[PDB]
Design a protein around this ligand. Sequence first.
Ligand SMILES: OC[C@H]1O[C@@](CO)(O[C@H]2O[C@H](CO)[C@@H](O)[C@H](O)[C@H]2O)[C@@H](O)[C@@H]1O
Ligand SMILES: OC[C@H]1O[C@@](CO)(O[C@H]2O[C@H](CO)[C@@H](O)[C@H](O)[C@H]2O)[C@@H](O)[C@@H]1O
Length: 382
Amino acid sequence: DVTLTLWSLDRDIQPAPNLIKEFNALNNGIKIEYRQLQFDDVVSESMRAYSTGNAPDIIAIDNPNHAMFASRGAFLDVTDMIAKSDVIKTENYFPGPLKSVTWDGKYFGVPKATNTIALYYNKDLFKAAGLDAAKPPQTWDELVDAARKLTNPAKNVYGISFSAKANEEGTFQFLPWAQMAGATYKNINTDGAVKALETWKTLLDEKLASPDTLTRSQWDSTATFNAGNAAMAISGPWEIDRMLKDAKFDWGVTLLPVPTPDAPRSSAMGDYNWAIFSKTKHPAEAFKAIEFFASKDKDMFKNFGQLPARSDIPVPPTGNALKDEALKTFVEQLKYAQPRGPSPEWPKISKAIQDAIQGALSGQMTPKAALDQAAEKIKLVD
Ligand SMILES: OC[C@H]1O[C@@](CO)(O[C@H]2O[C@H](CO)[C@@H](O)[C@H](O)[C@H]2O)[C@@H](O)[C@@H]1O
Ligand SMILES: OC[C@H]1O[C@@](CO)(O[C@H]2O[C@H](CO)[C@@H](O)[C@H](O)[C@H]2O)[C@@H](O)[C@@H]1O
C-alpha cells in the first residue's frame, strides 16, 4: 500500500477519523494514518513541520489559516486535479469556502465543511423563569435581560455560556457582535465594536457568564450548557450530536441576537478545508483520499451533525425534531456569515483582537483603548 498521513483536530466522534476508517476498508492500495492535532499551536507546528520535512500528506486546516500556507508554497496546487475530477467540482461549493482555498488564481485545497455560531437555549429553564420558551431573545438588550433572569447561583446556573479564550475561539466568537454593530476586522474600533465589547463586559461583570469564559473553549463552555449549568450557549453545529446525547432537557436554537431592533444579522464563516502539503510523495493518492471524503459529504449532517460546504447537496432533515430545528437555524445564520480574510497574516490580526478582548474583560484597559490598540496593530499587519 501507499501509506498517507493525515492531521486534523477532529475528535473520534467527528468526521475525519471515521472517514479514514471507511477509506481504509476499501483496500484500494492506499492506507491513511491519522494523527489528532494537540496543543493549540497547530499553525506554527504545521508550518515548522513543512519547513523541516515532517509535514503530513493531508491536513484539515481552519479556513482563515489557509492563505498563510498557500501563499508560502506549503500547499499543493490542486487546480488541475480538481478540474479533472468529477467528484470534486468547484461549482458545488459555496463561494466563501471556495475563495478560502484559493491563492493567486489557483486552488490550494478543497473545503471540508462550513459553519457559524448561533444561540442555543434551555427551554425548560426559560419556562421555569417565567419566560416564553417559544420566544427567545432577538436583541442584545433582550439577551442580557434574559441572562440576568436565568442566572441563579443557588442552582448553579449561569444565564449564558460562550468563549472569550485568547486564541481563535475568542476572535470567532467576538467578530459576529462587532460585525452586527457595523465594525469589521479591518475597522475593529468603531463605536459599535466598543458597544459589543461593553456588552461582553456586562455578561462577565454581572456574573451572567462564568469567569472561565476568559480561558475556556467553545466546546468546553457548551458542555456546561449540556449539564444544565448554563441556560443559553453561543456555539456551532458541531455541538449538536453530543448535545442530543447529553442534554437532558428541551432546547432550541435561534439566530444570534442583534444590537438594536431590526439591526442586521452577521457572523464569521467557520470550519475547515482539506489541503495537501506541497512536497508530498503521493499527490494523486492524497487527492483520491480527498475525493473519497467529498463523496461522503451528503451524509455529514446525519452522521456527525456538521454541514457541508456545498450548495449542490442541501441538507435534508434527519427525522430527529431537535436536530432538524437546529439545522434550520444554522442554515439561516450561515446566510449571514462573513470570511475572516483572505489574509496570509490572519494569526497576527486575530491576536490583536484576542488581546483587546482580554484587556477589556480583565479591566486592564477600557474597551475603547483596547480596541484602538488592536486597530493600530491590524493597520500594520493587514
Ligand atoms: O428574551 C426573550 C424573553 O423575553 C421576554 C420578556 O421577558 O420577551 C421579550 O423578548 C421577546 C422575543 O423577542 C419579545 O417578543 C418581547 O416583546 C420581549 O419583551 C419573554 O417573553 C421571552 O421569552
Ligand atoms: O474539530 C475542530 C473543532 O474546532 C471548532 C470549534 O473550535 O472550530 C470552530 O471554532 C473555531 C474557533 O475556535 C473556528 O476558527 C473554526 O472555523 C470553527 O469551525 C469546531 O469546528 C470543531 O469542534
